[PDB]
Design a protein around this motif. Structure first.
Motif, PDB file in Angstrom:
ATOM      1  N   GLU A  39     -19.858 -22.782 -14.132  1.00 50.50           N
ATOM      2  CA  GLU A  39     -21.205 -22.528 -13.627  1.00 50.50           C
ATOM      3  C   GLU A  39     -21.197 -21.583 -12.437  1.00 50.50           C
ATOM      4  O   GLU A  39     -22.155 -20.837 -12.187  1.00 50.50           O
ATOM      5  CB  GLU A  39     -21.896 -23.858 -13.320  1.00 50.50           C
ATOM      6  CG  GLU A  39     -21.312 -24.617 -12.140  1.00 50.50           C
ATOM      7  CD  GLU A  39     -20.243 -25.625 -12.499  1.00 50.50           C
ATOM      8  OE1 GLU A  39     -19.457 -25.420 -13.461  1.00 50.50           O
ATOM      9  OE2 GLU A  39     -20.228 -26.671 -11.836  1.00 50.50           O
ATOM     10  N   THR A  40     -20.100 -21.539 -11.672  1.00 50.44           N
ATOM     11  CA  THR A  40     -20.042 -20.645 -10.513  1.00 50.44           C
ATOM     12  C   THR A  40     -20.048 -19.177 -10.916  1.00 50.44           C
ATOM     13  O   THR A  40     -20.557 -18.328 -10.158  1.00 50.44           O
ATOM     14  CB  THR A  40     -18.836 -20.916  -9.622  1.00 50.44           C
ATOM     15  OG1 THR A  40     -17.612 -20.710 -10.356  1.00 50.44           O
ATOM     16  CG2 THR A  40     -18.866 -22.318  -9.062  1.00 50.44           C
ATOM     17  N   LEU A  41     -19.501 -18.823 -12.083  1.00 50.20           N
ATOM     18  CA  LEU A  41     -19.496 -17.440 -12.550  1.00 50.20           C
ATOM     19  C   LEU A  41     -20.892 -16.892 -12.739  1.00 50.20           C
ATOM     20  O   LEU A  41     -21.142 -15.698 -12.520  1.00 50.20           O
ATOM     21  CB  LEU A  41     -18.691 -17.367 -13.848  1.00 50.20           C
ATOM     22  CG  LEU A  41     -18.545 -15.976 -14.462  1.00 50.20           C
ATOM     23  CD1 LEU A  41     -17.877 -14.952 -13.535  1.00 50.20           C
ATOM     24  CD2 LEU A  41     -17.773 -16.080 -15.768  1.00 50.20           C
ATOM     25  N   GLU A  42     -21.856 -17.770 -13.075  1.00 48.27           N
ATOM     26  CA  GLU A  42     -23.230 -17.376 -13.302  1.00 48.27           C
ATOM     27  C   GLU A  42     -23.939 -16.822 -12.067  1.00 48.27           C
ATOM     28  O   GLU A  42     -24.912 -16.083 -12.186  1.00 48.27           O
ATOM     29  CB  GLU A  42     -24.053 -18.556 -13.828  1.00 48.27           C
ATOM     30  CG  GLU A  42     -23.550 -19.206 -15.115  1.00 48.27           C
ATOM     31  CD  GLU A  42     -24.373 -20.442 -15.465  1.00 48.27           C
ATOM     32  OE1 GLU A  42     -25.362 -20.793 -14.775  1.00 48.27           O
ATOM     33  OE2 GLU A  42     -24.041 -21.106 -16.466  1.00 48.27           O
ATOM     34  N   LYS A  43     -23.412 -17.085 -10.865  1.00 51.15           N
ATOM     35  CA  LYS A  43     -23.974 -16.544  -9.650  1.00 51.15           C
ATOM     36  C   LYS A  43     -23.614 -15.084  -9.425  1.00 51.15           C
ATOM     37  O   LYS A  43     -24.200 -14.425  -8.564  1.00 51.15           O
ATOM     38  CB  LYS A  43     -23.469 -17.364  -8.450  1.00 51.15           C
ATOM     39  CG  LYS A  43     -24.084 -18.758  -8.354  1.00 51.15           C
ATOM     40  CD  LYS A  43     -25.542 -18.716  -7.937  1.00 51.15           C
ATOM     41  CE  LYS A  43     -26.199 -20.082  -7.898  1.00 51.15           C
ATOM     42  NZ  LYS A  43     -27.607 -20.028  -7.389  1.00 51.15           N
ATOM     43  N   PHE A  44     -22.657 -14.550 -10.170  1.00 55.54           N
ATOM     44  CA  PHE A  44     -22.191 -13.186  -9.987  1.00 55.54           C
ATOM     45  C   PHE A  44     -22.834 -12.282 -11.033  1.00 55.54           C
ATOM     46  O   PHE A  44     -22.320 -12.144 -12.140  1.00 55.54           O
ATOM     47  CB  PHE A  44     -20.669 -13.080 -10.067  1.00 55.54           C
ATOM     48  CG  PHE A  44     -19.948 -13.785  -8.950  1.00 55.54           C
ATOM     49  CD1 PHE A  44     -19.635 -15.129  -8.987  1.00 55.54           C
ATOM     50  CD2 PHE A  44     -19.588 -13.051  -7.819  1.00 55.54           C
ATOM     51  CE1 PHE A  44     -18.988 -15.775  -7.961  1.00 55.54           C
ATOM     52  CE2 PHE A  44     -18.941 -13.671  -6.766  1.00 55.54           C
ATOM     53  CZ  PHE A  44     -18.645 -15.032  -6.850  1.00 55.54           C
ATOM     54  N   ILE A 102     -23.559 -25.464  -1.004  1.00 53.33           N
ATOM     55  CA  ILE A 102     -22.369 -26.018  -0.351  1.00 53.33           C
ATOM     56  C   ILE A 102     -21.407 -26.559  -1.386  1.00 53.33           C
ATOM     57  O   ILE A 102     -20.198 -26.346  -1.252  1.00 53.33           O
ATOM     58  CB  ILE A 102     -22.751 -27.094   0.683  1.00 53.33           C
ATOM     59  CG1 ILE A 102     -23.578 -26.463   1.819  1.00 53.33           C
ATOM     60  CG2 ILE A 102     -21.524 -27.815   1.211  1.00 53.33           C
ATOM     61  CD1 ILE A 102     -22.784 -25.466   2.637  1.00 53.33           C
ATOM     62  N   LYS A 103     -21.894 -27.192  -2.456  1.00 48.83           N
ATOM     63  CA  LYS A 103     -21.016 -27.695  -3.504  1.00 48.83           C
ATOM     64  C   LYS A 103     -20.168 -26.569  -4.093  1.00 48.83           C
ATOM     65  O   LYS A 103     -19.011 -26.813  -4.506  1.00 48.83           O
ATOM     66  CB  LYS A 103     -21.807 -28.434  -4.569  1.00 48.83           C
ATOM     67  CG  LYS A 103     -21.263 -28.852  -5.899  1.00 48.83           C
ATOM     68  CD  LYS A 103     -22.343 -29.601  -6.690  1.00 48.83           C
ATOM     69  CE  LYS A 103     -22.140 -29.590  -8.186  1.00 48.83           C
ATOM     70  NZ  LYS A 103     -21.394 -30.796  -8.681  1.00 48.83           N
ATOM     71  N   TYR A 104     -20.681 -25.353  -4.189  1.00 49.80           N
ATOM     72  CA  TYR A 104     -19.912 -24.236  -4.735  1.00 49.80           C
ATOM     73  C   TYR A 104     -18.918 -23.711  -3.708  1.00 49.80           C
ATOM     74  O   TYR A 104     -17.816 -23.273  -4.079  1.00 49.80           O
ATOM     75  CB  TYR A 104     -20.777 -23.092  -5.235  1.00 49.80           C
ATOM     76  CG  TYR A 104     -21.570 -23.324  -6.497  1.00 49.80           C
ATOM     77  CD1 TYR A 104     -21.687 -24.548  -7.123  1.00 49.80           C
ATOM     78  CD2 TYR A 104     -22.219 -22.246  -7.069  1.00 49.80           C
ATOM     79  CE1 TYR A 104     -22.408 -24.724  -8.304  1.00 49.80           C
ATOM     80  CE2 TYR A 104     -22.954 -22.391  -8.239  1.00 49.80           C
ATOM     81  CZ  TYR A 104     -23.049 -23.628  -8.842  1.00 49.80           C
ATOM     82  OH  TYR A 104     -23.804 -23.723  -9.991  1.00 49.80           O
ATOM     83  N   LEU A 105     -19.203 -23.798  -2.423  1.00 44.13           N
ATOM     84  CA  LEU A 105     -18.218 -23.510  -1.377  1.00 44.13           C
ATOM     85  C   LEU A 105     -17.115 -24.544  -1.420  1.00 44.13           C
ATOM     86  O   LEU A 105     -15.941 -24.215  -1.152  1.00 44.13           O
ATOM     87  CB  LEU A 105     -18.875 -23.420   0.006  1.00 44.13           C
ATOM     88  CG  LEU A 105     -19.941 -22.303   0.170  1.00 44.13           C
ATOM     89  CD1 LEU A 105     -20.471 -22.345   1.603  1.00 44.13           C
ATOM     90  CD2 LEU A 105     -19.376 -20.944  -0.178  1.00 44.13           C
ATOM     91  N   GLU A 106     -17.401 -25.791  -1.743  1.00 44.24           N
ATOM     92  CA  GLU A 106     -16.370 -26.809  -1.919  1.00 44.24           C
ATOM     93  C   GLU A 106     -15.491 -26.411  -3.128  1.00 44.24           C
ATOM     94  O   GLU A 106     -14.266 -26.488  -3.056  1.00 44.24           O
ATOM     95  CB  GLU A 106     -17.022 -28.178  -2.185  1.00 44.24           C
ATOM     96  CG  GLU A 106     -17.741 -28.778  -1.003  1.00 44.24           C
ATOM     97  CD  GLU A 106     -18.624 -29.981  -1.227  1.00 44.24           C
ATOM     98  OE1 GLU A 106     -18.764 -30.436  -2.380  1.00 44.24           O
ATOM     99  OE2 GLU A 106     -19.215 -30.418  -0.224  1.00 44.24           O
ATOM    100  N   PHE A 107     -16.098 -25.976  -4.233  1.00 43.04           N
ATOM    101  CA  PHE A 107     -15.312 -25.550  -5.390  1.00 43.04           C
ATOM    102  C   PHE A 107     -14.375 -24.388  -5.064  1.00 43.04           C
ATOM    103  O   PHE A 107     -13.193 -24.412  -5.487  1.00 43.04           O
ATOM    104  CB  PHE A 107     -16.227 -25.150  -6.571  1.00 43.04           C
ATOM    105  CG  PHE A 107     -17.057 -26.238  -7.175  1.00 43.04           C
ATOM    106  CD1 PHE A 107     -16.746 -27.585  -7.146  1.00 43.04           C
ATOM    107  CD2 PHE A 107     -18.224 -25.853  -7.844  1.00 43.04           C
ATOM    108  CE1 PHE A 107     -17.535 -28.539  -7.749  1.00 43.04           C
ATOM    109  CE2 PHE A 107     -19.036 -26.814  -8.446  1.00 43.04           C
ATOM    110  CZ  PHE A 107     -18.688 -28.125  -8.381  1.00 43.04           C
ATOM    111  N   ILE A 108     -14.843 -23.375  -4.308  1.00 41.41           N
ATOM    112  CA  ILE A 108     -13.916 -22.274  -4.014  1.00 41.41           C
ATOM    113  C   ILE A 108     -12.832 -22.747  -3.068  1.00 41.41           C
ATOM    114  O   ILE A 108     -11.664 -22.282  -3.139  1.00 41.41           O
ATOM    115  CB  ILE A 108     -14.608 -20.984  -3.553  1.00 41.41           C
ATOM    116  CG1 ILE A 108     -13.691 -19.762  -3.775  1.00 41.41           C
ATOM    117  CG2 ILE A 108     -15.095 -21.055  -2.095  1.00 41.41           C
ATOM    118  CD1 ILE A 108     -14.343 -18.403  -3.485  1.00 41.41           C
TER     119      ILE A 108
END
Ligand code: HEM
Length: 154
Positions: A39-44, A102-108
């Motif tokens: 799901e994080t790829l969708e932000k790019f 913030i959850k996506y900053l935790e993932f990175i």
């Protein structure tokens, strides 16, 4: 939440190894992030079409992005907590333009830790990993506070 000087030196001593080849480290971290949390790829907007690890590794633009991202993180870490000036622009862009929770900053952060653990066992034993986690938790705490000041729930 404040790190000791010893803890900061464990952070900086593994970062010195990342800096032998920041581009290659950035590639490994993005591949890990995108495979673990797709799901994080969708932000790019520029990279969301990449379908496979092979495409990710072959993307010159993603490689250049990883260099920009890890160099910005490295400048933060080298401040040893005195990173208010560096966090302002990053929080504003990430809260308002990119909309990164913030959850996506935790993932990175998890992907960074995973890649350092795999590549750098000489400088990323348990104590060094603990120090890096503390530094990334501090980063995320301070970014979250800036997000709230900026109007973003995160
Ligand atoms: C260690 C955490 C991170 C750091 C230090 C970081 C740093 C940066 C920097 C320096 C830029 C370029 C300048 C700017 O727009 O602010 C950038 C762009 C961007 N970041 Fe981050 N970032 C982080 C985490 C994330 C995460 C987890 C996501 C998404 C899941 C994300 C999404 C983006 C996007 C979408 C852009 C624009 C990319 C493009 O131009 O194609 N960032 N980031």
């Amino acid at each position: 939440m404040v790190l000791s000087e010893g803890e900061w030196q464990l952070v900086l001593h593994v970062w010195a190894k990342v800096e032998a080849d920041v581009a290659g480290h950035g590639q490994d971290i993005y591949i890990r992030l995108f495979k673990s949390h797709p799901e994080t790829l969708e932000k790019f907007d520029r990279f969301k079409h990449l379908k496979t690890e092979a495409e990710m590794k072959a993307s010159e633009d993603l490689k250049k992005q990883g260099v920009r991202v890890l160099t910005a993180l490295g400048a933060i870490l080298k401040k040893k907590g005195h990173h208010e000036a560096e966090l302002k622009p990053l929080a504003q862009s990430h809260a308002t333009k990119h909309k990164i929770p913030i959850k996506y900053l935790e993932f990175i952060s998890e992907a960074i830790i995973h890649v350092l653990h795999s590549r750098h066992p000489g400088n990323f034993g348990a104590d060094a990993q603990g120090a890096m986690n503390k530094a990334l938790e501090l980063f995320r705490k301070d970014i979250a506070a800036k997000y709230k000041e900026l109007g973003y729930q995160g």
